[PDB]
Amino acid sequence: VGMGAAALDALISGVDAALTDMTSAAASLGSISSRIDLQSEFVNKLSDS
């Protein structure tokens, strides 16, 4: 409220940086989940063997 149309660009840049960091975190979480799925499949195959 009453920002002044000067620091709004900096606020947008900070919000975008946070959004990019969260997108990277979500990608890392998805990669971890895929790794757990692959590990579970491999462990099941090894136990069967």
Binding site: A10, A18, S28
Partner: protein, 49 residues
Amino acid sequence: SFVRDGSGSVAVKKVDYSLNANSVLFDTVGDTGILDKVYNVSQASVTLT
């Protein structure tokens, strides 16, 4: 996974996920993390004549 080393020993392997200041999502103590960090690409700019 559970791995039995060839040299007569056993161990357990783990998958590590790092909760650093980039994927913390509202650190509960110091408020230092995704919040309060800028890492902004640039700064507010104005073109003058």
